[PDB]
Design an enzyme around this catalytic site. Structure first.
Site, PDB file in Angstrom:
ATOM      1  CG  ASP A 163      37.800  42.138  39.434  1.00 42.20           C
ATOM      2  OD1 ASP A 163      37.001  41.209  39.072  1.00 42.20           O
ATOM      3  OD2 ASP A 163      38.258  42.186  40.613  1.00 42.20           O
ATOM      4  CB  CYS A 202      35.633  36.038  37.692  1.00 44.12           C
ATOM      5  SG  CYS A 202      35.832  34.634  38.713  1.00 44.12           S
ATOM      6  CG  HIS A 238      37.477  37.347  41.638  1.00 39.64           C
ATOM      7  ND1 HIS A 238      36.145  37.253  41.319  1.00 39.64           N
ATOM      8  CD2 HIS A 238      37.871  38.573  41.209  1.00 39.64           C
ATOM      9  CE1 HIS A 238      35.780  38.327  40.637  1.00 39.64           C
ATOM     10  NE2 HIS A 238      36.796  39.173  40.618  1.00 39.64           N
TER      11      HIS A 238
END
Lengths: 168, 169
Positions: free
Chosen positions: B87, B34, B72
């Protein structure tokens, strides 16, 4: 996705509610809803929730739909926060909202998320009332034209794209 | 529960992202991706006309005594007035406690919140959005850190579980 909050002891509340056969009858066979408001409300009052309200809900599949789907939940405050007991939510499990797979006892935010995320195409809005028969009158199951409905006091859970197109 | 919004054509954005082999690789193998995904996704959104791009740093706390929270990152951009969260490595959590997070997400801001909120019963989840990606990576790093000494100023709470409310004294 989860049905019972751990903000409060919803697991135990649900156990207790199921010992009322009026309620349990619906938790086992959730089709056909209003009649729950009273026993659920009473329950909540005994457990110390206050500012108890009755939430009338409409679910609209399409703009031109003749009768929207109605639904009811009871809302109550416990230590400053709102909770929604919606023990018959799962009558929608096989009606395009399979994420609604059992009774719900959720924080107000969780409840909105539960419905919002259960569907992409359905328009879902509500109003809270102080009285359950006012709720049942305002969100009745009689023919109704979406174009002629007042959105005054309606709180949107979803707003499908068709509905924004529809508004114009 | 859906992973792509119909508010915008998230299905087509997803598919165009998956057309890029570097991004495809990271979506297929999302664990730990991420951070590196922020710039490429951000560049994509920029190209697609999103503005006010921000970088969302996120902590997920399992308990107050956890040594390092899980972090994250996602990217936020505005399209015709509304915020959308890309995302695309969210499914890194699928086989790690958050099984409802089962694919890449391109959702409305509120949809993205619901997805995370309803994916856990008892993790504390909070985030902050930054104009700069490297500031985000720094703010929400994976170094030892005590929850008790975190400032909550500028944190936005996706969850606030019972235990954390207690912990707050």
């Amino acid at each position: 996705t989860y049905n019972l909050t751990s903000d409060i002891d919803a697991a135990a509340y649900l156990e207790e509610l199921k010992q009322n056969p009026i309620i349990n009858n619906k938790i086992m066979n959730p089709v056909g809803c209003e009649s729950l408001m009273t026993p659920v409300s009473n329950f909540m009052n005994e457990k110390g929730f206050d500012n108890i309200r009755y939430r009338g809900i409409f679910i609209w599949d399409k703009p031109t739909e003749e009768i929207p789907t109605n639904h009811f939940a009871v809302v109550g405050n416990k230590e400053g926060k709102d909770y929604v007991f919606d023990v018959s939510a799962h009558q929608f499990e096989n009606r395009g909202m399979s994420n609604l797979n059992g009774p719900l006892i959720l924080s107000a935010d969780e409840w909105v998320c539960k419905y919002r995320m259960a569907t992409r195409r359905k328009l879902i809005y509500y109003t809270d009332f102080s009285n359950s028969s006012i709720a049942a009158n305002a969100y009745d199951a009689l023919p109704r034209e979406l174009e002629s409905e007042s959105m005054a006091g309606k709180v949107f859970v979803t707003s499908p794209r068709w509905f924004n197109t529809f508004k114009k």
